[PDB]
């Protein structure tokens, strides 16, 4: 019944391993710290409830332990006790949760060498995430290259197509009056204009086409890099908690 | 070349590569003469030349003048059409395009009411900085391009004024007295606090005191020389035109810190009046409600679906959207997830419920949401991971509350964000198409909801105890507050204007998600005293979101924020932008007006704001802004494109060297950068241009001879510039600079400025110890400038002029100070090692060996590679990367190889210590620093977990005295037992 032999009592762990164990968690989960301020004396109690993580000193005198002046219970484990059955509104109206899942301790339900193979697995799986990442943002940054090159050969098609409407305009009143006249040369020189346009256009839009080729291929293994760094991560994060876990076995 | 004539006509040219427009458009016209439509065109002055650039934008060339290989073609084609529309103004508009890396015309597609809103409002504060800048022509120009660059307090340090000969300055005038350049020397004895005009009049009384002047001619004549000539800086151009006293400029003063002889010029100022020109700015041509608290429902939003999730369907098992309301970084309630769904059909179309009520939004709340994914192995081994993220406020730029369906781009998750929704990040949609596009909706209520008009709607809804609040008072910014002090300090919130500086800690006591307490803080705030700049900072993080607190802050600032701290501070005051719900805010018009009115200050504005175009989250807000400063910059935009060429051919340069010529050895490489460098287009774009680091420092001719490519990682490029003032010889004739592409700058960048920052408290401390925080600018992505420090050789450099003994730093500090002044080589060694020792523990630096450790001659000591810091070991008790080998401590006691016996040891200890405490008591100031670059992208800080390494190198959960015997516990663990004493 001791307080160091409790479930949720973890000692003097940072605000940061509070953070990293209640992030996500239910409301009413709490576990009790001891204080910040490692002189010897008061607890917190830092427990989960509208999304943050309230924090509740424990202050201690003449022995006896509480959230207020009146300080009437006899120990912090008594206190906690009390408060798991009972609601903290009874403390404080401004939060009406109830301390309900203590964020047990006792989950850890040769091992020098296990950690080993943990520290190369996450090793080589860290790397195949940074290998992807940057050619992930390699090939994102060059998509954008392509995507944008798009956009200026689109320009160019506009610029080019709008000479053919001009050519048509204006072509008019110099082929009608070169057939009345008979003038052939400049009527196929007229023509030969038009060949040289539409050939240019025709280059145009063939290095155009060849590049919204080579623009899909390069997509589609964008979103191939993106799907194998998604598969990864989870195991990622998965192998570097358990390696954590195991570390903090052998320290002990 | 193919020219589209306009007739039709389609005419191929020969041109040539460097061949100019007007050329171009002259042999086009006689060339369109073999054609049969030659006859039916005009003269060539009637046509421009259009066509489209890399960026894939038409473009109209106005400017004639420019070459083709300048134009930035796509493809080699012209097009000619008649000029249509404004030259000068389509002229500036290409020139702003350039300097800011992406076109103008591209704002005026986007069709968001709060961009279109914001880039011509904005206009106003460009104005009223204009017409500022004009109120004393032509004085006030020659302040804006020449603004003082004085301290903040006028007071010297005691230590500093003790280096004074009975508080006067000894001070070398120099006079231009002839056509060939004839420079005379006045050495001239002045008190440290004569204003420039009176420094003037004593240099003109020993310049005219040889004919004997009459005292009323000698008057007559110095009163005439008060009104015609100025001071100038020898070797640069820094220049003395407000009359603060001498001492506080910080040329004077780091004259007298370092014990040198000030160099000044006495320039006619006519001269100055001539070299400003007149400059102009002109306007752009495109310059049923009901109040949210009678709503009474709670807010609930639609999930639709989602599209082109990437993620393998054989391996995650389904995928759901988690969302949350959010004030800051804090849940105004439960987090709501969807139900898990197959990812094959990410289709919801459920209702989130949240427990909020509408009437107690806050007006900074926002809705952040995410796509995450389930791995559901055997139960309570599930593992959930985000795969996009996105946030959408509230309330929009109008205070209108968010209403109907709305399609939402999510980003792709930052690297290394573990964490299931992304408060921190920006808000609004991806413009990147191909993303995750996710389908809300917002009820509606049968008419637009308005947050309250508060101005009218803020009426609506012993002993022991001050020392408890002075307590709460003194806790740094990070610290927790508990819920008992929540409730104390909202008890006493009235009481708490005794004390203003209590302030931040009062906010965070506020429930944000209630109307009633919000309400009565808003009434508080407009009646709170103003507190100081380094507290008003604070206000500006992420956790003080509301548009109140941070309108309170930005005043405070406003009022009490002088133009040395500005500069100081500008880095952090442009990050914190981002944090900004909408494009126009308060800090922005006061970033922005400081920078129209200080060109000093416009300079690390738009290298700091383009130094992050890159990132496509910020990409349209910096441009925005930086359109905004580049129309009324100026004169300086054509320094800035002149600098934007420069380091765009340095950029291509490098890009070559490390895609292509990457496999070759050093030699041919040196070949080809030799090769490429003394081309003509080469070396008219690298010469004559402001430098980058230092707009005051001009980069002159090249000296091909001493740049070269260097050994270190990824073959940085080692620059070298001529000095071309006249007086560049007092000062330096060598401006030499590294340019890194491959190496991110921008947390090197920010130690340094940290080193400065606590540098600069502890002189003011009284403990003299020397730091070099040397130049730096990230320009890009993962490119940089690096000043280069004159004399300098890494230790490795020095145990290289040999096995190299123990003694060898040492014994060569020792030779190159012979004689007397050994013994001050010696102690700035000391004083050096002692701060940079104090600095890298506190801020956890990158591990330190022989070849990123650098001495001087001098004998001071500093260090250059700053990667990593606040140590990003953790993926792998805090350590200290700087450790004081017998190297070292053989230099600092005098030779003596005794590791922990010798008094100069116990000295150098004792330096540690003050300093460490100096630090210490300063907590504040560099927690709000780190805590205002965590949306800056940066992976050694995200959140604010990782700046909790500092609050325990500084030991602030501690007792000052308990900190120190920390610190002596971290140095001689470290330092094998050699600190505990």
Same mark, same amino acid.
């Given at each position: ?252 | ?65 420019? !070459?083709?290989?300048? +134009?930035?073609?796509? *493809?080699?084609? %012209?097009? @000619?059409? $008649?000029?249509? /529309?404004?030259?000068?103004? &389509? ?117 005219? !005191?040889?004919?004997? +002047?009459?005292?009323? *001619?000698?008057? %007559?004549? @110095?009163? $005439?020389?008060? /009104?015609?000539?100025?001071? &100038? ?749």
């Amino acid at each position: 019944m001791s307080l160091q032999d409790a479930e949720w009592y973890w000692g003097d762990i940072s605000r940061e391993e509070v953070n990293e164990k209640l992030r996500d968690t239910a409301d009413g989960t709490f576990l009790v710290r001891d204080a910040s301020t490692k002189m010897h004396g008061d607890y917190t109690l830092t427990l989960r409830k509208g999304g943050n993580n309230k924090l509740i000193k424990i202050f201690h005198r003449d022995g006896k332990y509480g959230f207020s002046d009146p300080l009437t219970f006899s120990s912090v484990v008594e206190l906690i006790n009390h408060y798991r059955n009972e609601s903290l509104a009874q403390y404080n109206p401004k939060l009406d949760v109830k301390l309900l899942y203590p964020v047990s301790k006792y989950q850890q339900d040769a091992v020098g060498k296990k950690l080993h193979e943990y520290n190369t697995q996450f090793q080589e799986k860290s790397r195949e995430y940074d290998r992807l990442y940057e050619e992930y943002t390699r090939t994102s940054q060059e998509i954008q290259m392509k995507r944008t090159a798009i956009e200026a050969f689109n320009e160019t098609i506009k610029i080019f197509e709008e000479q053919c409407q001009t050519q048509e305009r204006y072509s008019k009143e110099y082929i009608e009056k070169f057939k009345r006249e008979g003038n052939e040369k400049e009527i196929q020189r007229i023509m030969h204009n038009y060949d040289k346009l539409k050939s240019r256009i025709s280059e145009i839009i063939d290095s155009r086409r060849r590049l919204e080729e080579d623009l899909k291929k390069q997509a589609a293994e964008y979103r191939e890099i993106d799907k194998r760094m998604n598969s990864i991560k989870p195991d990622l994060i998965q192998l570097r908690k358990t390696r954590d876990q195991y570390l903090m076995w052998l320290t002990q | 070349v193919e020219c589209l004539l306009p007739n039709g006509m389609i005419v191929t040219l020969e041109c040539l590569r460097e061949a100019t427009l007007i050329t171009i458009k002259h042999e086009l016209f006689k060339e369109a003469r073999k054609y049969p439509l030659h006859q039916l065109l005009q003269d060539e002055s009637s046509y421009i030349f259009v066509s489209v650039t890399q960026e894939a934008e038409r473009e109209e060339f106005f400017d004639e003048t420019r !070459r083709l290989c300048d +134009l930035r073609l796509f *493809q080699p084609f %012209l097009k @000619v059409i $008649e000029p249509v /529309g404004n030259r000068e103004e &389509k002229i500036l508009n290409r020139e702003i395009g350039f300097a800011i890396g992406m076109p103008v015309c591209e704002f005026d597609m986007v069709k968001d009411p709060e961009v279109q809103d914001f880039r011509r409002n904005i206009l106003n504060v460009c104005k009223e900085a204009v017409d500022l800048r004009d109120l004393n022509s032509p004085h006030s120009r020659a302040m804006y391009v020449y603004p003082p660059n004085v301290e903040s307090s006028p007071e010297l340090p005691k230590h500093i004024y003790n280096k004074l000969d009975k508080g006067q300055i000894i001070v070398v005038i120099w006079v231009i007295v002839s056509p060939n350049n004839d420079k005379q020397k006045y050495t001239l004895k002045i008190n440290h606090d004569c204003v420039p005009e009176q420094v003037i009049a004593e240099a003109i009384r020993k310049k005219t !005191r040889s004919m004997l +002047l009459s005292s009323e *001619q000698l008057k %007559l004549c @110095v009163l $005439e020389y008060q /009104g015609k000539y100025i001071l &100038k800086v020898c070797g640069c151009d820094e220049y003395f035109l407000e009359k603060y006293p001498l001492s506080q400029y910080k040329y004077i003063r780091s004259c007298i810190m370092l014990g040198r002889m000030p160099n000044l010029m006495l320039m006619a100022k006519e001269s100055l009046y001539s070299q400003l020109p007149m400059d102009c700015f002109t306007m752009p041509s495109y310059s049923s409600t009901k109040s949210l608290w009678v709503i009474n429902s709670a807010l609930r939003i639609k999930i639709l679906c989602a599209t082109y999730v990437n993620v393998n369907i054989r391996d995650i098992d389904k995928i759901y959207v988690r969302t949350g309301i959010y004030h800051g970084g804090e849940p105004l309630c439960d987090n709501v997830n969807t139900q898990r769904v197959p990812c094959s059909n990410p289709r919801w179309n459920e209702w989130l419920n949240y427990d909020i009520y509408i009437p107690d939004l806050p007006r900074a709340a926002r809705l952040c949401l995410s796509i995450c994914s389930v791995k559901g192995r055997k139960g309570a081994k599930e593992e959930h991971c985000p795969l996009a993220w996105g946030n959408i406020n509230l309330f929009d730029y109008t205070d209108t509350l968010v209403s109907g369906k709305m399609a939402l781009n999510l980003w792709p998750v930052p690297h290394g964000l573990e964490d299931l929704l992304n408060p921190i990040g920006v808000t609004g949609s991806n413009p990147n198409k191909e993303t995750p596009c996710l389908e809300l909706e917002f009820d509606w209520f049968s008419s637009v909801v308005k947050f309250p008009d508060m101005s009218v709607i803020e009426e609506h809804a012993r002993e022991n105890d001050k020392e408890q609040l002075k307590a709460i008072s003194t806790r740094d910014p990070l610290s927790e507050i508990t819920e008992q002090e929540k409730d104390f300090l909202w008890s006493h919130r009235h009481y708490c204007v005794t004390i203003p500086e209590i302030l931040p800690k009062l906010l965070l006591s506020v429930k944000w998600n209630s109307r009633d307490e919000v309400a009565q803080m808003y009434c508080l705030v407009k009646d709170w005293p103003p507190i100081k700049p380094e507290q008003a900072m604070e206000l500006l993080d992420c956790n003080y979101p509301d548009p109140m607190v941070r309108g309170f802050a930005v005043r405070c600032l406003e009022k009490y924020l002088t133009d040395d701290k500005l500069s100081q501070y500008l880095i952090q005051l442009v990050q914190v932008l981002k944090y900004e719900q909408y494009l126009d805010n308060l800090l922005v018009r006061f970033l922005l007006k400081k920078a129209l009115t200080n060109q000093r200050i416009g300079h690390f504005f738009f290298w700091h704001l383009k130094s992050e175009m890159h990132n496509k989250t910020v990409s349209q807000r910096f441009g925005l802004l930086l359109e905004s400063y580049c129309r009324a910059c100026g004169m300086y935009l054509k320094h800035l494109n002149r600098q934007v060429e420069a380091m765009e051919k340095l950029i291509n340069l490098t890009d070559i060297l490390k895609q292509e010529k990457k496999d070759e050895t050093q030699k041919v490489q040196m070949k080809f950068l030799v090769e490429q460098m003394r081309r003509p287009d080469f070396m008219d774009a690298l010469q004559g241009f402001l430098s980058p680091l230092n707009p005051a420092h001009q980069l002159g001719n090249l000296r091909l001879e001493e740049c070269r490519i260097m050994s270190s990682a990824k073959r940085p490029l080692w620059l070298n510039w001529e000095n071309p003032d006249i007086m560049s010889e007092l000062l330096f004739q060598n401006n030499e600079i590294i340019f890194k592409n491959g190496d991110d700058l921008r947390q090197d960048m920010l130690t340094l400025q940290i080193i400065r920052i606590m540098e600069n408290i502890w002189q003011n401390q009284g403990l003299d110890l020397r730091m070099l925080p040397y130049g730096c600018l990230s320009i890009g992505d993962c490119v940089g400038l690096i000043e280069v420090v004159r004399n300098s050789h890494t230790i490795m450099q020095i145990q290289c002029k040999g096995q190299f003994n123990s003694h060898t730093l040492h014994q060569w500090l020792k030779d190159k100070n012979k004689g007397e002044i050994y013994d001050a080589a010696i102690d700035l060694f000391t004083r050096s090692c002692a701060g940079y020792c104090v600095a890298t523990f506190i801020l956890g630096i990158g591990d330190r060996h022989n070849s990123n450790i650098m001495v001087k001659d001098d004998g001071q000591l500093f260090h250059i590679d700053f990667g990593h810091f606040l140590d990003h070991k953790k993926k792998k008790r805090e350590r200290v990367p700087f450790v004081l080998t017998q190297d070292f401590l053989i230099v600092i006691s005098k030779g003596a190889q005794e590791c922990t016996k010798t008094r100069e040891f116990e000295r150098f200890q004792e330096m540690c210590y003050k300093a460490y405490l100096a630090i210490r008591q300063h907590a504040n100031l560099f927690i709000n620093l780190f805590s205002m670059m965590l949306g800056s992208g940066m992976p050694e800080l995200q959140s604010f977990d990782d700046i909790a390494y500092i609050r325990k190198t500084l030991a602030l959960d501690k007792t000052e005295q308990e900190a120190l015997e920390y610190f002596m516990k971290q140095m001689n663990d470290a330092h094998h037992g050699g600190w505990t004493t």
